[PDB]
Amino acid sequence: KNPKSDKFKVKRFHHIEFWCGDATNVARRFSWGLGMRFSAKSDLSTGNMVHASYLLTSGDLRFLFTAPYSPSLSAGEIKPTTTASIPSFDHGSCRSFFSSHGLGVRAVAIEVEDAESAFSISVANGAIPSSPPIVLNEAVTIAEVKLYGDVVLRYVSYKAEFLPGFERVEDASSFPLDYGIRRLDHAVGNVPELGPALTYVAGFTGFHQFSGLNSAVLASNDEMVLLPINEPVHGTKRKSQIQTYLEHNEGAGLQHLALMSEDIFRTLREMRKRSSIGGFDFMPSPPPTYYQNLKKRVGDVLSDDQIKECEELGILVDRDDQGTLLQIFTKPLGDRPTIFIEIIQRVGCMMYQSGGCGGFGKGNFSELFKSIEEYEK
Amino acid sequence: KNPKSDKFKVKRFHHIEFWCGDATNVARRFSWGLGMRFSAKSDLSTGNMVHASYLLTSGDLRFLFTAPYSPSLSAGEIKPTTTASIPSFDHGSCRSFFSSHGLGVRAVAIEVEDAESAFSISVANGAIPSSPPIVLNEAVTIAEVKLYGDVVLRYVSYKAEFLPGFERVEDASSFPLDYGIRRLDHAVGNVPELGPALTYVAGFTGFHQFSGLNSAVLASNDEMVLLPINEPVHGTKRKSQIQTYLEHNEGAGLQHLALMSEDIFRTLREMRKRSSIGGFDFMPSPPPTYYQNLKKRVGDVLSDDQIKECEELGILVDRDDQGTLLQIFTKPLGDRPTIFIEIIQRVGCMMYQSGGCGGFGKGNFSELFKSIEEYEK
Numbered sequence A, B: 001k002n003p004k005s006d007k008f009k010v011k012r013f014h015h016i017e018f019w020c021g022d023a024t025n026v027a028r029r030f031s032w033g034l035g036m037r038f039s040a041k042s043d044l045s046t047g048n049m050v051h052a053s054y055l056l057t058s059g060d061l062r063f064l065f066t067a068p069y070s071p072s073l074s075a076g077e078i079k080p081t082t083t084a085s086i087p088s089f090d091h092g093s094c095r096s097f098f099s100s101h102g103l104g105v106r107a108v109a110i111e112v113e114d115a116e117s118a119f120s121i122s123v124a125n126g127a128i129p130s131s132p133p134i135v136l137n138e139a140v141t142i143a144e145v146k147l148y149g150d151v152v153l154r155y156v157s158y159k160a161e162f163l164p165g166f167e168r169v170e171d172a173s174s175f176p177l178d179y180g181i182r183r184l185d186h187a188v189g190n191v192p193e194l195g196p197a198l199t200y201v202a203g204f205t206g207f208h209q210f211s212g213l214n215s216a217v218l219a220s221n222d223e224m225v226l227l228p229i230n231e232p233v234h235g236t237k238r239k240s241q242i243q244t245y246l247e248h249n250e251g252a253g254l255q256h257l258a259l260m261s262e263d264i265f266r267t268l269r270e271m272r273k274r275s276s277i278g279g280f281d282f283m284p285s286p287p288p289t290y291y292q293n294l295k296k297r298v299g300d301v302l303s304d305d306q307i308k309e310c311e312e313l314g315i316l317v318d319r320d321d322q323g324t325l326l327q328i329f330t331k332p333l334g335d336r337p338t339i340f341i342e343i344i345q346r347v348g349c350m351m352y353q354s355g356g357c358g359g360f361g362k363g364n365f366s367e368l369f370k371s372i373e374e375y376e377k
């Protein structure tokens, strides 16, 4: 049941922005670990005296890494005279975000038809404004409203190359890394109370509903913008990982980013080769029991050798009434046990592939738990 | 003329500590870019609720990367009950250092005979105390005094494995990277006024004197701890890079770390292969003129093929009355045009090799300048 109630025209996920202490080192680490190319920059070399911003791309996935310079470089500036390429940026906000949360996502950006009307309609419908619409070089419009915690939903609209003021990166500094990641599938928030979080976001977007936690998913009209939200379930045997998140993050924020791969086998081979030489680490692999039980539940989707390849790579598998999902989770991206990355690939729901095909893997909590018990046996 | 006037017994450089916003991402970037292994950790997994610290090693070179957790994790703690493994660490100091300077060296640590007496003698002789001697697990003593800006000189002494409370890293997360770097050769500060800086540091250590800047070098008794200091020369045609440093760094601080390689050819081959895939970038190479002129001034030290190999790798060469030095400079390590790394290898002065053999390359300012003019010709 999709009532298609978006209060404005939403296209696709556009980019994700990390607020960093040093954007150079985070961006270089992420580039090597995920196989993303350096594609654009805005920094001192492009005349930006306010912040350093570096853009990584893989397919349609766009990761932006931003950190503030010393405020003294831009002391004589005012907003009308700013050299910042992202005019919503504020030194004090960025330093306070990072001191409070550590490394994390500041902005979940979606491309819309008209960011100004998206901003107006959202605020008229209960959204808390964060940054008003601003038109950059008569070409791009950006605006921001609060999503949860200190994370903003950023609207971007183009009249007709990332953002004005960003320069394309010279091919020499731009090595064409690619491990097969192609787009952002979904972005997940952790909140203390799911109910009010859902009501707030669904209220101002018109997005419709699609051990440890309760969860629900908000989706755009074509269900290609997917925003799950989690809350903790207290008193449990094992402590809720959502609760641990809220403690170490100093409250609500983005929990994980799910990146669709065109070939999750190759992506995981390439990422695992680099885990211990600067890349990302992965969750411990499920026991062989789990892969033994895969034949019975997806043996009509995946061959034995594709199942054995899932086993070599530590991949999880879940299935809907409509599709099959292959997924794996990284360890936390930085110092705090907060944000992590999910790699996914979806099988089925051909029409193009409909969004969310196969679900989000919630069947794996019990399937992994069972298999852990069966391996102890 | 070495009067051997150290006011306490100094052994060798022990480690360099970076204060970071996210120690995980800086450490992983540095590990891949410099070929340093993860060798020790102190973080949540080892019971440290205060800071995340990760140690990289290559030969005797020790790089420590530290960042604070949320203060709320350790709210009930007091210094007598601290879970911090580095008891001089302070959340507010670390956040203020990083907000003010960005990514940079907080501590230059030297191993001494007795850090408590090193601390007492230093302060009795004009050093500004930063952190008093503290004995960790009856095994190691650490103390700190101000060096310049917000950089401390850290004394460490061992009764008889990095520091108590640090755990050795499991071999799986410890990939044995090695590009040939073996030890810290020297650590260089930038200050607004050289005279008072020298008088202060030489005053409390007893260390003796060994286009753009004025410079002098302080050295320990055996001249294996080398601490050059630079000041800007104003009014020049080209703007002093020392002055640019002080502007972007918000004042005095560590300018560069020189890392001795046992084979600077292999080190530079390995680092340059990784520059655009997460590693470090290097200064633009000198023109072929410069390598043409190398035959006349070091043609008795290096073969034509070793000179042509310097040319392939962009290496600089200078020579003393006693030795020959091969060196190269990275671009800045992070967002700000402040700290960078030098790779060096020294030829000559065999007795072991005496410290500082060949000097520090000051002859290259004019030699590079000349060669740039000759290449335009």
Ligand SMILES: Cc1c(C(=O)C2=C(O)CCCC2=O)ccc2nc(C(F)(F)F)n(-c3ccccc3)c(=O)c12
Binding pocket: A186, A188, A215, A228, A229, A230, A241, A256, A258, A283, A329, A342, A360, A361, A362, A364, A365, A366, A368, A369
């Ligand atoms: C986050 C996530 C997801 C999933 O992506 C996420 C969706 O996007 C939105 C719905 C709720 C949420 O769950 C799905 C299955 C998962 N399954 C497990 C597992 F228990 F099966 F391994 N874990 C897990 C891994 C390590 C430690 C603790 C839990 C997950 O974190 C996990």
Ligand SMILES: Cc1c(C(=O)C2=C(O)CCCC2=O)ccc2nc(C(F)(F)F)n(-c3ccccc3)c(=O)c12
Binding pocket: B186, B188, B215, B228, B229, B230, B241, B256, B258, B283, B329, B342, B360, B361, B362, B364, B365, B366, B368, B369
């Ligand atoms: C730092 C350094 C050193 C050297 O290590 C450093 C010593 O440890 C202590 C003495 C003073 C100081 O100078 C030596 C030669 C250098 N020579 C040049 C060069 F001009 F020849 F390339 N540059 C340079 C490179 C790029 C832009 C501007 C200057 C240097 O930064 C440079």
Ligand SMILES: [Co+2]
Binding pocket: A186, A188, A256, A258, A342, A360
């Ligand atoms: Co997910």
Ligand SMILES: [Co+2]
Binding pocket: B186, B188, B256, B258, B342, B360
């Ligand atoms: Co030097």
